Amino acid sequence: ESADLRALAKHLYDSYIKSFPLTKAKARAILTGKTTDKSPFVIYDMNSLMMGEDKIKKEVAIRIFQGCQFCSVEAVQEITEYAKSIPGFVNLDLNDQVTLLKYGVHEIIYTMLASLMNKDGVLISEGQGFMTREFLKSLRKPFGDFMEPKFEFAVKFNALELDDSDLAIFIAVIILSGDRPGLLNVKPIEDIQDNLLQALELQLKLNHPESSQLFAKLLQKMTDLRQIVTEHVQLLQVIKKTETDMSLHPLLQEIYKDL
Amino acid sequence: RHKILHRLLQE
């Protein structure tokens, strides 16, 4: 019934608060100055970048791209911790869990990245940096076209004014996608996603009673996500070829290969 | 095959 679906939205929301340190809540506080706490160090150019190293953790584009690698890796670890709390996920065939995560974590990275973005830039190092969108375009090809698709998604996506408790179910719906290439056993995956989709719809009716067909609007964006992902994998294919001083992190390499 | 993922999962 409706009761069991609110319980599921609650379990998911709690796991999400526990698994993800910088939530959309904090991120909007920071981005609005409404935190009334220490503003982030703004990185708008080459000099601001190198002055910034104190609040952050050989070529600039190559250094930016490879620093995002450590962030991606800690994201994959947070998202993997999170998936394990999705009821019935860990009881799946371990080979299915790996496949769902492999195809899922980048779609969730771009989903949650949008929480940290406005039209002008994106929070970095857990909200204590803010790197400008223009500075990121300012990078040298093929690095100047890396974050611009994500800024483009984030501005349309942030329109739906979702909050952490909507995103917690939405994330879980993305992971439990029964149509991932290579799934040994689709049905029990689709059983869980059916429940999650029902929980998401309830949550969206309750938390946004004025907002209408937010549920429908949000399922079409799960498509926008897959293309920002395939576009992303190609741009890596290119720079893995054109730039071979660069090291791809082992974990990132496990994911993107056979994708 | 996916030894870091297998390991993050089964951790």
Q: What is the DSSP letter of A37?
A: S
Per-residue burial over A129-153, b = 16 or more CB atoms within 10 Å of its CB, e = otherwise: bbbbbebbeebeebbeebbebbbeb
| Sign of the four-CA dihedral A252, A258, A259, B2 | negative
- Beta bridge partners, A123, equal A130
Q: Gap positions in chain B, given as the residue before each gap (C–N > 2.5 A)? A: none
Contact A123, A56 (CB under 8 A): no
First CA to last CA across chain A, in angstroms? 38
Q: What is the DSSP letter of A117?
A: B
Experimental technique used? X-ray
First CA to last CA across chain B, in angstroms? 16
Contact A239, A142 (CB under 8 A): yes
Contact A6, A97 (CB under 8 A): no
Q: Are B4 and A251 an interchain contact pair (Cβ–Cβ within 8 Å)? A: yes
Q: What is the DSSP letter of A229?
A: H
Per-residue burial over A67-82, b = 16 or more CB atoms within 10 Å of its CB, e = otherwise: ebeeebeebbbbbbbb
Contact B5, A102 (CB under 8 A): yes
Contact A94, A64 (CB under 8 A): no
This PDB structure is determined at a resolution in Å of 2.7
Angle at A131 between CA A125 and CA A132, to 5 degrees: 160
Contact A167, A75 (CB under 8 A): no
| Sign of the four-CA dihedral A161, A172, A128, A229 | negative
- Residue A29: how many other CB atoms lie within 10 Å: 15
Q: Are A102 and B2 an interchain contact pair (Cβ–Cβ within 8 Å)? A: yes
Q: Are A98 and B9 an interchain contact pair (Cβ–Cβ within 8 Å)? A: yes
With CA atoms as reference, the chain A residue closest to B6 would be A98
Q: Does B7 touch chain A (CB under 8 A)?
A: no
| Ramachandran sector of residue A49 (left: φ over 0; alpha: ψ -120 to 50; beta: rest) | alpha
Q: Which residues make Cβ contacts (< 8 Å) with residue A142, sequence separation at least 6?
A: A235, A238, A239, A242
Task: In whole angstroms, give the CA distance from residue A215 to residue A229.
Answer: 22
Q: Does A102 touch chain B (CB under 8 A)?
A: yes
Concatenate the DSSP letters of all residues of A44-94 into one string: -SHHHHHHHGGG----HHHHHHHHHHHHHHHHHHHHHHHHHHSTTSTTS-H
Name chain A contacts of B10, Cβ cutoff 8 Å.
94
Q: Which residues make Cβ contacts (< 8 Å) with residue A150, sequence separation at least 6?
A: A110, A113, A114, A117, A122, A228
